[PDB]
Amino acid sequence: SYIKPLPSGDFIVKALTPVDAFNDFFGSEFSDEEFDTVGGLVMSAFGHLPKRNEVVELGEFRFRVLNADSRRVHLLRLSPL
Numbered sequence: 726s727y728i729k730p731l732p733s734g735d736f737i738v739k740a741l742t743p744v745d746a747f748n749d750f751f752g753s754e755f756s757d758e759e760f761d762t763v764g765g766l767v768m769s770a771f772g773h774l775p776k777r778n779e780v781v782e783l784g785e786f787r788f789r790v791l792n793a794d795s796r797r798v799h800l801l802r803l804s805p806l
Contacts, residue, residue: 726739727739727741727742727743727746727747727750728742728750728803731802733804734804734805735802735803735804735805736751736802736803737791737800737801737802737803738763738788738800738801738802738803739763739799739800740762740763740764740767740797740798740799740800740801741762741763741764742762742763743757743761743762743763744756744757744760744761744762744763744765744766745757747763751786751803753784753785753786754784755783755784763788763801764797764798764799764801766783767781767783767788767790767798767801768797768798770783770788774793774795774796774797774798775790775793775798776790776793777790777791777792777793778790782806785805785806786803786804786805786806787803787804787805787806788801788802788803789801789802789804
């Protein structure tokens with residue numbers, strides 16, 4: 726549902742993924758008090774609505790925008806650092 730494994734070892738992650746769920750999958754420690762969803766985590770780090778192929782590094786991961794529309798991020802590619 727939330728994640729799709731890729732054979733590179735990266736993941737496609739839905740922006741609506743709860744941060745609690747994300748930390749459980751990936752071993753990260755992002756704040757579930759400060760953030761509700763991965764897209765919120767990413768949009769805060771950008772400080773704007775990103776376009777496809779914008780990238781941010783947070784924690785031990787790289788987040789690359791695969792899909793966003795005019796309102797929100799939809800899909801991120803997650804790579805380990």
